[PDB]
């Protein structure tokens, strides 16, 4: 079986590392210099706007998946007429547009931050009048990290936010800040028949809006049960096949949906070294029509390497640390690798401090 | 750093799967259709007899290793003048020739089967007269599996064995059969500075001369201590860097060296799923000049897939079984994949019976 992946970044790289031992063959749409290239059979560079050319590429394979949900869902529909794509165009359409995403949650009685579609300055003033500050004006589509957004903290920021962002091609959304205690994510995988394998909750720490640490299992039984119910709902409504990630804000014993990603996700990278079957292997099994692998887990911390990465020789000296370099070059804000460590005992917790020190000296956020 | 591997078979494939997450780049000398191709950066087809061309290929990389010890050790020497090769030409020269291998053990007071260099029919008759039957006449070099050998069980077999094998280019060796109880192997990895990481002993089951099952840890403390001493001796004498495998016959509480392989070995494949750092990751760390990863292990069985492999859909249903298909085509006697399973409990031991049944129905030995 041949699997085509749209995108040749680190998620594609890790999908192939996980899926290749299953005897599956991987091909990416991307560029020669991209980090998945060395671990996939072929890479083909096609502009996504060339729908006919993308479809012709896709027809070479048995199933197609993708690593970036910001892709046109209509392109996905066109491909799916010829070769099965997973997960669904509906999942992409909803997850990729913040307004559609929050509106979908609301329509299903699922809690989110307060939000308003912003299509005029007057609408923004009304949104602030109704839901208050601090808040953020964001592009509905795209806006990777700090891009496509303006944080509104004072009345005088309202007009400034509007003037900066009003011409965004795909519109804007107001979102009120949530005063959460911490953040967690629920990752799961759904097979072709709708059976779901659940990972334990991961607790995620962000710095400057980027995940820097993920720890699993996060053993709060009430939250986990609630998160699992939400996952089941999204899987059904999207007719979802593959790995799905849901990020939450936590307030006391309540969950609030933050956002979803219809793919393997950074907050699941711990599962490479902490679960019997990683989120990557299971995504591959799902889309290949195979039964999912066991997701029994053990305590693991994942530390992200942003901007730069400690020297491999320094990391290797911490002999229980599992190194995941994506073989990228440094650049401020760029995800260049991550480190996983099982936490069983004291030798582990102090190897962890050493990793943190190395990361602190190498990162650029 | 770029690592060149001579050979593009399943061992190279697994070296790259293990080493790529460390941020290392892999290149093979081999053919496009070989199973490592899809997981390495480049593959280059050069006949090994073209020494100048092989050396020119090797100069592109930072370190060179190999997956088949039957390579010319003089070629290795030529390469090593320009770019570091690990492990050593001495390790290759000794391990690849059964007479040199056994002679080396004997010269160091290490036990092996009784053996005689056979360079005439009269010498063979004398060898049988001295050490008896059953025995085997084998080529000193090559002789993969049942190739290059003739089992001698009666007096009348002596002349037949000689007539068949006498023109072997690199000579012959007589070996008396050992009445062993079972077989075990010691795998270890030595770093650039001579520090050794030891794996637990694996107990290996052969069928028709091919390993079909490996189980680790084999918890016999006396044997393990003896095997570790032998490993230390070979590492020192070979100035060895990389993963080394030593196969033994066991008679009671005594070990007898069977043969050695200066590389990752089939009897260590369990370590992909049963050790913190697999024999493959550690080979890569060793030759890259990195400190070795922790080798803490858990009970794991490896089952080999010879000739054919069960359907992936059938294997996937046994959700704790870790699948390692090499993406090869079937052929009698060919190693096409292996399966690993951690044995923690009862759900495991009965998933194991199911794997065995699937393998029994698919294998061709
Ligand atoms: Cl990339
Ligand atoms: Cl091959
Ligand atoms: Na490639
Ligand atoms: Na989303
Ligand atoms: Na390749
Ligand atoms: Na040998």
TrEMBL record, chains A, B:
Entry binding sites for ADP: 98, 138, 145-146, 149, 175-176, 178, 183, 206
A matching Pfam family: RS_preATP-grasp-like
Pathway: Purine metabolism; IMP biosynthesis via de novo pathway; 5-amino-1-(5-phospho-D-ribosyl)imidazole-4-carboxylate from 5-amino-1-(5-phospho-D-ribosyl)imidazole (N5-CAIR route): step 1/2
Domain called ATP-grasp: residue spans: 102-288
Chain sites annotated for binding AMP: 138, 149, 175-176, 178, 183
GO molecular-function term, one example from the UniProt record: 5-(carboxyamino)imidazole ribonucleotide synthase activity
KW Lyase (keyword) present: yes
Positions of ATP binding: 98, 138, 143-149, 175-178, 183, 206, 258-259
Enzyme Commission designation: 6.3.4.18
One GO cellular component, as annotated: cytosol
Enzyme class: ligase
Protein family membership: Belongs to the PurK/PurT family.
Subunit note: Homodimer.
Free-text function comment from the UniProt entry: Catalyzes the ATP-dependent conversion of 5-aminoimidazole ribonucleotide (AIR) and HCO(3)(-) to N5-carboxyaminoimidazole ribonucleotide (N5-CAIR). Catalyzes the ATP-dependent conversion of 5-aminoimidazole ribonucleotide (AIR) and HCO(3)- to N5-carboxyaminoimidazole ribonucleotide (N5-CAIR).
PANTHER family, per the entry: PHOSPHORIBOSYLAMINOIMIDAZOLE CARBOXYLASE (PTHR11609:SF5), PURINE BIOSYNTHESIS PROTEIN 6/7, PUR6/7 (PTHR11609)
Name of this chain's protein: N5-carboxyaminoimidazole ribonucleotide synthase
Gene: purK
